[PDB]
């Protein structure tokens, strides 16, 4: 779930592209403070928003995480990424959650959609809206 002030693409960016700190515990505070809960697992791709938008231009493929969807796209090239895993769940005081960080080089599959007409910038008619998988 995402806060109301973000479009799916802006949330995708906040969750999977803008790692505000190379450390998972700090980077996750942003997502957690927005979601009002400590996300158990989250991947940050060490790539640019424009790069992912271009991956959206790759051939459509079935989303492995939602088999009924055909709006996914495979990166075709591996990218460095950091996977954050919750090590200290704290349902009562989320600013207290701690995470581990796991660096890797893998492909990514992103679900893409037409932009939010009213709130997304016209610059990108097609945008990533979900990180379906890293393989
Ligand atoms: N409405 C949706 N349609 C397709 N994939 C979704 C949707 N909501 C979440 N996902 C993706 O399904 C997986 C599980 O989502 P969740 O943990 O929120 O239930 C994640 O890859 C997530 O990507 P993302 O985290 O980029 O939204």
CATH number where 44 lies = 3.10.130.10
Phi then psi for residue 106, to 5 deg, are -145, 175
Residue 116's domain comprises 1-135
User: How far is Cα 102 from Cα 66, in angstroms, rounded to an integer?
Assistant: 25
73 is catalytic: no
Q: How far is the CA of 11 from the centre of ligand 1 (A)?
A: 11
Q: How far is the CA of 73 from the centre of ligand 1 (A)?
A: 14
Q: How far is CA 111 from CA 1, 38, 75, in A?
A: 16, 23, 11
User: How far is Cα 44 from Cα 118, in angstroms, rounded to an integer?
Assistant: 27
Q: Reported resolution in A?
A: 1.8
Which technique was the structure solved with, according to the deposited record?
Answer: X-ray
Q: Which ligand 1 atom is at minimum distance from the Cα of 132?
A: 21
Nearest-CA residue for ligand 1 atom 1 is: 130
Our count of domains for the chain comes to: 1
Q: Which residues fall within 8 angstroms of residue 36, CB to CB, at 6 or more apart?
A: 94
The candidate with the shortest Cα–Cα distance to 47, out of 79, 95, 86, 25, is 79
Nearest-CA residue for ligand 1 atom 7 is: 130
């Amino acid at each position: 779930m995402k806060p109301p002030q973000f479009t799916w693409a802006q949330w995708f960016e906040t969750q999977h592209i803008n790692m505000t700190s190379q450390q998972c515990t700090n980077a996750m505070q942003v997502i957690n403070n927005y979601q009002r809960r400590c996300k158990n697992q989250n991947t940050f791709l060490l790539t640019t928003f424009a790069n992912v938008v271009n991956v959206c231009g790759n051939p459509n493929m079935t989303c492995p995480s939602n088999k009924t969807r055909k709006n996914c796209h495979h990166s075709g090239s591996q990218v460095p990424l950091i996977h954050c895993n919750l090590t200290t769940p704290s349902p009562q005081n989320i600013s207290n959650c701690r995470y581990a960080q796991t660096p890797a080089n893998m492909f990514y599959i992103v679900a893409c959609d037409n932009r939010d007409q009213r709130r997304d910038p016209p610059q990108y008619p097609v945008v990533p809206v979900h990180l379906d998988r890293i393989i």
